[PDB]
Amino acid sequence: THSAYVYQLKAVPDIFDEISQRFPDRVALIFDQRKITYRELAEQCSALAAVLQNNCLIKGDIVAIKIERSPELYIFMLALMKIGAVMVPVNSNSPERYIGEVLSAAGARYLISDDVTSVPGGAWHVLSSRTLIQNCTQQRSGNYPVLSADDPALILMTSGSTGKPKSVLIAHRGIARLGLPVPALGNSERDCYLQIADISFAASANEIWMALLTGACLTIAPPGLPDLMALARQIESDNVTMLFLSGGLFRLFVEVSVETLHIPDCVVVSGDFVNPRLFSVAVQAGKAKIFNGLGCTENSAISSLYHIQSAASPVPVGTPLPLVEMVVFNERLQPCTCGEYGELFIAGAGVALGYSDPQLTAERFITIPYQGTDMLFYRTDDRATYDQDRNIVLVG
Ligand SMILES: Nc1ncnc2c1ncn2[C@@H]1O[C@H](CNS(=O)(=O)NC(=O)c2cccc(O)c2)[C@@H](O)[C@H]1O
Ligand SMILES: [Br-]
Ligand SMILES: [Cl-]
Ligand SMILES: [Cl-]
Ligand SMILES: [Cl-]
C-alpha cells in the first residue's frame, strides 16, 4: 500500500518495506567507507527480526538499546519496530548510574548492548547485539504483527522547564510522519542526512527517520563526542544535503568554520534559543538555507521550521511540518491574536501517547475544540505569540 491520502500513516516497518521495495538500489546507510543499500538493509532487518522473535521478544516488550553508532544500530531499530517492541534508546555516553535509572524508569525488560561488560545490572536481562547479529540466517520468514500508526514505538526521557523528569511514550505515527516530504526543505530520496544526534534524544529521529523513510541516505557519524574536523570531511565526502544541528554544534561551526554549513542545501538548528547574530553570520556566509527549528520530545521529532532570510526579538520558529498543527492559546484556551501572548500547544501526528505518569499526562495532553475538530493538544509550557505573517515566535 502506497496511499496518496497524506493523513493516512502506516506503522514504521510498513513504510520502510514500501521504501525499500521502491528504492532497493539506493544507498541507505554509510559508516566510514562501508555502504549498505535499501535492499541489503531490508534483508538484514528481516533476518534480525526473525532472530529477535525466536528469542521470545514480542510486540509490547520494553527493549532498551545501548549500541554505539554503527550500521548495526539502525538494523536493530528497524527490527525492533518490525516486531512491535518498544525501544528505549540509551545514551552510550552516560554514566552507568544514570542508565540504570533510565531503564528502571522505562520498565525495560531487556537491554541489547554492544558491550555487555559496561552495562548496569538490574531486573533487565542483558542481550549481546554482537551475538544476535551473528545468528542471523538467510531465512527471514516470520509471522509478524499487524501494527498500526498508534502502537507505541519508543520511550524517550525528557525534563520540564523546572527540571522535573518525564518518560514519554512515542507512537509509530510520530516518527512515521517524517516520511512525508517537508515542503520547506524540499527533501526527497536524493538527499543525504548526517546521524550525529544521540539516539536517546528525540532530535535523532530527524536524522534517522527522515532519511530511511524517504529513500534518502543516512551517513553515520563516528561514535563518541563530536570531532568537527571529521564531521566537516564527512559532510563533504558523503555529500550531506540536509544537516540537522543542535545549538552547540551550530554555534561552534559558526565560530570555527562557517563555510562548512554551506556545503549542504539546508541547515536546521533546533533545541533552544539561538543568538540571532549567529544566524546572521551563517546566512551571510553562503547560499545554504538556514532554519530555526522547533521540536519537543512530546511531539516525537522536529515540528516547525522558519527559514531565515534577512536582518529585520528571538527568531520565529515558523510554520509546522506536515500533519502538525501549532496554536498559541491564551489563558482561556482561545487562539491568540497577532501580538497577544499565550502558550504554544501542538497537535497532530507527532503528539506522544502520553507520559508514564497518568496525572501529568492529563495535565499536559488536553483536548480542545479547534477549527471544527476536538483536537488533542500537547501543552508545551513555551510562552509564545504570532508575528505579522502568522509565524510563531517563542518568547521565553
Ligand atoms: N528552535 C527553538 N527555539 C527556542 N526554544 C526551543 C527551540 N527548540 C526547542 N526549544 C525548547 O526546548 C523544549 C523541548 N526540548 S526537548 O529536549 O524535549 N526536544 C527537542 O529539543 C527536539 C525534539 C525533536 C526534534 C528536535 O530537532 C529537537 C521546547 O519546549 C522549547 O522550550
Ligand atoms: Br547561542
Ligand atoms: Cl532503486
Ligand atoms: Cl557510574
Ligand atoms: Cl513520566
Q: Ligand 5: distance of its center to the CA of 99 in Å? A: 16
Q: Partners of 43 in the beta sheet?
A: none
Report residue 276 as a C-alpha cell. Answer: 540571532
Q: Is the CB of 380 under 6 A from ligand 1?
A: yes
Q: Cβ(158) to ligand 1 under 6 A? A: yes
Would you say the CB of residue 315 lies under 6 angstroms from ligand 1?
Answer: no
Ligand number nearest to the C-alpha of 282: 2
Q: Measured between alpha carbons, how far is 195 from 30 in angstroms, rounded to an integer?
A: 10
SS (H, E, C) 220-280: ECCCCCCCHHHHHHHHHHCCCCEEEEEHHHHHHHHHHCHHHHHCCCEEEEECCCCCHHHHH
Ligand 1 atom nearest to CA at 244? 27
Domain containing 189 equals 12-307
Domains contained in the chain, number: 1
PDB resolution in Å? 1.8
Cα angle 190, 11, 153 (rounded to 5 degrees) comes to 105
List, as ranges, residues with CB under 5 A of the ion ligand 5: 166-167, 355-357
In a domain, 359, yes or no: no
CA distance 154 to 267: 26
Ligand 1 binding pocket mutation candidate from 270, 307, 385 (most atoms within 8 A of CB): 270
Judge whether 392 lies within some domain.
no
337 found inside a domain = no
Ligand 1 pocket check for 270: Cβ under 6 Å: yes
Would residue 46 count as lying in a domain? yes
Phi-psi region of 223 (alpha: psi -120 to 50; beta: other; left: phi over 0): beta
Residue whose C-alpha cell is 544476535: 132
Tell me how far apart the alpha carbons of residues 61 and 370 are, in angstroms, rounded to a whole number. 36
Q: Which protein residues have their CB within 5 A of the ion that is ligand 4? A: 95-97
Of 28, 29, 30, 79, nearest in space to 50 by CA? 79
Give the distance (Å) from ligand 3 centre to CA of residue 22.
Answer: 6
Residue partners of 38: CB distance under 8 A and separation at least 6 = 19, 20, 23, 24, 25, 26, 27, 28, 215
Q: Is the CB of 85 under 6 A from ligand 1?
A: no
| DSSP-assigned beta bridge partners for residue 126 | 111
The structure's method of determination equals X-ray
Which of 195, 165, 158, 202 has the alpha carbon at shortest distance from 293? 202
Q: Cα–Cα distance between 230 and 249 in angstroms, integer?
A: 13
Residue 63 bridge partners (DSSP): 87, 110
Could you give the CA distance from residue 377 to residue 396 in angstroms, rounded to a whole number? 20
Buried/exposed code over 283-297 (b: 16+ C-beta within 10 A; e: otherwise): beeeebbbbbbbbbb
The ligand whose atoms approach the alpha carbon of 98 most closely is 4
The span from the CA of 347 to the CA of 328, in Å, is 11
Tell me whether residue 313 is in a domain: no
24: its cell numbers: 532497493
Beta bridge partners of 393: 385
Cα 246 to ligand 3 centroid, rounded to whole Å: 32
Q: Compute the distance from residue 249 Cα to the ligand 2 centre, in Å.
A: 10
The amino acid that residue 97 corresponds to is R
Q: Which amino acid is residue 224, in one-letter code? A: G
297 lines ligand 1 (CB under 6 A): yes
Please check whether residue 326 lies inside any domain of the structure. Answer: no
Distance from residue 96's CA to the centre of ligand 4 (Å): 4
Is 242:266 a contact under the CB 8 Å cutoff? yes
Q: 292 in ligand 1 pocket by Cβ < 6 Å?
A: yes
Which residue in this structure is represented by grid cell 512491535?
Answer: 84
Partners of residue 37 on adjacent β-strands: 27
- Tell me if 265 is assigned to some domain: yes
From the CB of 203, is ligand 1 less than 6 Å away? Answer: yes
Helices 203-212 and 71-82 meet at what angle, rounded to 10? Answer: 80
Please tell me what DSSP assigns to residue 357. Answer: S
Q: What's the sign of the alpha-carbon dihedral 114, 117, 123, 128?
A: positive
The three cell numbers of residue 167 are 518518560
In CATH, what number is assigned to the domain containing residue 212? Answer: 3.40.50.12780
Rounded Cα distance between 268 and 246, Å, is: 8
For residues 218 and 207, what is the distance between their CA atoms, to the nearest angstrom? 7
Looking at the domain assignment, is residue 124 inside a domain?
Answer: yes
Query: Does ligand 1 have an atom closer than 6 angstroms to the CB of 317?
Result: yes
